Design an enzyme around this catalytic site. Structure first.
Site, PDB file in Angstrom:
ATOM      1  N   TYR A  53     -38.645   1.574 -15.450  1.00  0.00           N
ATOM      2  CA  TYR A  53     -37.809   0.943 -16.489  1.00  0.00           C
ATOM      3  C   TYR A  53     -38.491  -0.287 -17.076  1.00  0.00           C
ATOM      4  O   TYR A  53     -38.936  -1.184 -16.331  1.00  0.00           O
ATOM      5  CB  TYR A  53     -36.528   0.506 -15.852  1.00  0.00           C
ATOM      6  N   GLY A  60     -31.455  -1.345 -21.378  1.00  0.00           N
ATOM      7  CA  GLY A  60     -30.048  -1.447 -21.783  1.00  0.00           C
ATOM      8  C   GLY A  60     -29.574  -0.102 -22.310  1.00  0.00           C
ATOM      9  O   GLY A  60     -29.697   0.943 -21.604  1.00  0.00           O
TER      10      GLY A  60
HETATM   11  N1  LIG Z   1     -30.987  -6.503 -17.562  1.00  0.00           N
HETATM   12  C1  LIG Z   1     -31.570  -5.226 -17.973  1.00  0.00           C
HETATM   13  C2  LIG Z   1     -30.902  -3.951 -17.400  1.00  0.00           C
HETATM   14  C3  LIG Z   1     -31.480  -3.503 -16.069  1.00  0.00           C
HETATM   15  O1  LIG Z   1     -32.442  -4.147 -15.591  1.00  0.00           O
HETATM   16  O2  LIG Z   1     -30.998  -2.520 -15.485  1.00  0.00           O
HETATM   17  C4  LIG Z   1     -31.347  -5.153 -19.415  1.00  0.00           C
HETATM   18  C5  LIG Z   1     -30.052  -4.844 -19.849  1.00  0.00           C
HETATM   19  C6  LIG Z   1     -29.803  -4.757 -21.216  1.00  0.00           C
HETATM   20  C7  LIG Z   1     -30.840  -4.988 -22.139  1.00  0.00           C
HETATM   21  C8  LIG Z   1     -32.136  -5.274 -21.680  1.00  0.00           C
HETATM   22  C9  LIG Z   1     -32.394  -5.367 -20.309  1.00  0.00           C
END
Ligand SMILES: *N[C@@H](CC(=O)O)c1ccccc1
Ligand SMILES: *N[C@@H](CC(=O)O)c1ccccc1
Lengths: 513, 513
Positions: A53, A60
């Site tokens: 990811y 997101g």
């Molecule tokens: N915080 C991130 C989500 C994840 O790590 O699972 C994220 C969420 C929304 C948009 C960008 C990054």
């Protein structure tokens, strides 16, 4: 300097002091090697065609989108722009500093795979004194706040440098730093964790713990002012419940008042009452025990001291964590998708801190009614107006201030860590709101010092009226320091500035907060 | 039997089980000797003309009134009548039993100077099954609730005995017990402490901890239902934050799902996505990581497990305390006026438990939206309506129930331990409201089980739709037990009774609460 070495945990006291004083970060060698190795592992995973990811997927709402490694820079720059959606006033420099130090701590653990070049750049930007402008409202619990920082690190957005607001690029140029070039994972690693709520949360804990300690001396001074008895604070009776915070609070007060002759010896009162006994039911001017805001002080502040210990532990643990996603385990060279950015522990801790602050507020608001109401004040003049009562109103109006701020604070104590609303196509479907929880504590702490200030102002005027010959040493020190800011008041005068002065000078360590 | 021996602390689990099962109290010899000696010491203090609140003074608003020893009985009987001012519905038998056991525990420590005859009588009244009628509303934090009991102990007021409500005197006569005759201190010692909020508070903790444990298996079943990945629960990544509750929660779920083939192997998903890679930005039907109500479960329930540990400790300590005033130290034969009846520790603990309950509620309410909304459910039919969608609405309406009870619960989570109002001529000027805090938790726990019931109902219908061949052993046990109460639903049917059934039979241990 604020020294980071591998495997040695950072204390709240150290990060609070680093942020208040702008201490520079220095790194132990092993931290450098761990940060570097984490990036090498990730690169070798990318060669092995691992799917990770934020490295070759989008984030997101677009979690399911494949994105080529060749487009990494462009995805990471898009990411830090897209989620920088905070609004409202900018955080002060100390909170910004604490935030960036919490991020540096998290990244230093070597699980985030930020490059060693961008890690050092983050430290250098911090060290040289660049303070990104971080709008306080918004974020789910700290993309917004940390993306404002990531943008400044890349030569974008806005920052304060040497007392002036300017573009991120202007501040880097002046500080002598080239902007970060972000490759895969790197935007994400700079913004994906709990560092704003931690940075604010720690600064609040440190301020509160200090104010608590001071407030045990304000309490002792009150008790001298009200001629309260000290026997209910004796450690021997408190060892009859196994509550630790209560026994600590009573012990501190008991020790502080040991040399007071203003505080009252219960055995003397017992003798007076025994001498009035004649086999009839009758009223006495003396009473064997006092009202709860005096005698129950350990049972009321004890839970506050104990919930402070638990809050300290949660914050310490969240500061000394890898709060980022995904994470690389260096031993097994494995990558994990996980939920370590979720601020629920801090948000819950903040709601508990809020409750603790309002409990202290009620106590002090109630002490104030003991001083103002001559039926409650054990021989003090009404409204502590010793000369010309009726012609003058004395200090009667301070209670208009405190009861109002106490009431407002009681209304503001709804827990934020339960207010979760779902966003982002329900990918972010349950959220902490930990940074809002911390911002609300910060407001309540301002309120608390106002009400404390007036209790202390009351207490000083009360011991002046009793005569100060019998003050304990420790309470006389506090009385003296206050008397350098506020006189004994024998005429009616606006107290607005006096109260601001005591709040700022007696009850504050971190003046930025 | 519930055995009380000197210096051995009672656990919450033991007092909860004693109260649920009406176990009889038995006493160790040393407890008898300590209770007896405490009274002898007080008597010798009364001969020595000591002045002691509630012995030769009056109480509350009349603290300053001398009252002759000769008038002791009459003062103590007046006291228990005057403060019995609770109103509203009566507490159930289990809460009443827990309350009286907490009082017996406090008195057993030998600091209260209740007579050995009245101490044994309290135990005997408990043992024979008399349950005083205790109106739930009112009291400052537990005169009202405990005075309802003290009245029944003296042959007054009302009680349930063998399933019938009757006068206190009727119940004593039937049980074979002479009413207590109260001498000095004795009314006061029976009513002046934290035993109702403790008795209710412990029963709530025990119920909640059990429901939590069960809910980790409901979670595992959800994750099978939603085809969530289990790799984010691996203990190795959770050891990257030092939060203990989080690492325990992830470990339990990870171990429970180890043998599931419904839960998804992330490495398999990674391979599918890697095979779609072709150097273009594009959408995939697969995603490397899941929504927060799945992947962040340890980061969200971890704070709940940790705040439960702290609550357990506060309740344990408040149960194993001398919560009474005044108190006698047997070693030094000294009497102390003190604030040990103040319920602030329990009231604060209750507010934390309330917050923990609503946090779990949000999580499960959010799981439910994952099941209902086909965009979120990872391949399940809309509204879990597998046959005849449109002609039937499936389970769509259960979410009307849960979102409403979740919303109501969120609105009800204002902390009671900050709501202090001053009474009694300002003698009781800062108060805990700990019993109201506990009653509000009790309401929120009912709410929580309703919402849990529908998540579990959803999860069972979801795995039926997936095929249950791949269920883990532990989750299949839960699925089976639920399927004994609720069928797979292929036609639209009112679920009101099904939900009540699961709440009562799957999610409840203490059915009185
Ligand atoms: N915080 C991130 C989500 C994840 O790590 O699972 C994220 C969420 C929304 C948009 C960008 C990054
Ligand atoms: N709970 C008693 C007060 C004390 O012990 O200090 C009390 C308060 C009001 C009325 C009766 C007893």
């Amino acid at each position: 300097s604020f020294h980071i070495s591998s495997g040695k945990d950072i204390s709240l006291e150290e990060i609070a002091r680093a942020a208040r004083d702008h201490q520079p970060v220095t790194l132990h060698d092993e931290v450098v090697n761990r940060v570097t190795r984490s990036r090498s592992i990730l690169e070798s995973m990318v060669s092995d065609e691992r799917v990770i990811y934020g490295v070759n997927t989008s984030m997101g709402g677009f979690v399911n989108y494949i994105v080529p490694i060749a487009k990494a820079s462009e995805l990471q720059n898009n990411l830090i722009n897209a989620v920088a959606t905070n609004v409202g006033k900018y955080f002060d420099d100390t909170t910004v500093r604490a935030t960036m130090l919490a991020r540096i701590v998290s990244l230093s653990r070597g699980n985030s795979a930020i490059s060693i070049v961008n890690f050092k750049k983050l430290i250098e930007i911090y060290n040289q004194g660049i303070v990104p402008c971080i709008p306080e409202k918004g974020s789910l619990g700290d993309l917004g706040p940390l993306a404002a920082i990531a943008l400044v690190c890349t030569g974008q957005w806005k920052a304060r440098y040497q007392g002036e607001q300017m573009s991120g690029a202007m501040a880097l140029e002046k500080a002598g730093i080239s902007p970060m070039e972000l490759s895969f994972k790197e935007g994400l690693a700079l913004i994906n964790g709990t560092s704003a709520m931690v940075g604010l949360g720690v600064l609040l804990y440190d301020e509160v713990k200090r104010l608590f300690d001071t407030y045990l001396t304000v309490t002792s001074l009150s008790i001298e002012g009200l001629h309260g008895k000290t026997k209910p604070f004796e450690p021997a009776v408190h060892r009859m419940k196994p509550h630790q915070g209560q026994l600590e609070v009573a012990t501190t007060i008991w020790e502080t008042l040991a040399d007071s002759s203003l505080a009252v010896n219960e055995h003397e009162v017992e003798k007076l009452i025994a001498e009035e006994m004649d086999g009839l039911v009758k009223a006495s001017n003396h009473q064997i025990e006092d009202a709860y805001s005096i005698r129950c002080t350990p049972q009321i502040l004890g839970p506050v001291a104990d919930t402070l210990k638990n809050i300290k532990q949660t914050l310490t643990n969240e500061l000394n964590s890898s709060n980022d996603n995904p994470l690389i385990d260096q031993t097994t060279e494995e990558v994990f998708h996980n939920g370590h950015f979720h601020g629920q522990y801090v948000s819950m801790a903040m709601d508990h801190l809020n409750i603790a602050l309002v409990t202290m507020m009620n106590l002090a608001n109630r002490r104030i009614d003991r001083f103002m109401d001559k039926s409650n004040s054990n021989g003090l003049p009404p409204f502590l107006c010793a000369e010309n009562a009726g012609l003058r109103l004395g200090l009667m109006g301070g209670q208009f201030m405190t009861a109002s701020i106490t009431a407002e604070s009681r209304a503001s104590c709804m827990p934020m860590s339960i207010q979760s609303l779902s966003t982002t196509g329900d990918f972010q479907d349950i959220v902490s709101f930990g940074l809002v929880a911390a911002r609300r504590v910060r407001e309540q702490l301002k309120n608390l010092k106002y009400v404390f200030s007036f209790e202390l102002l009351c207490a000083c005027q009360a011991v002046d009226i009793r005569g100060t010959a019998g003050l304990s040493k420790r309470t006389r020190a506090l009385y003296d320091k206050t008397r350098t800011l506020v006189p004994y008041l024998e005429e009616d005068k606006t107290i607005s500035d006096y109260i601001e002065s005591i709040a700022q000078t007696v009850l504050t360590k971190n003046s930025d907060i």
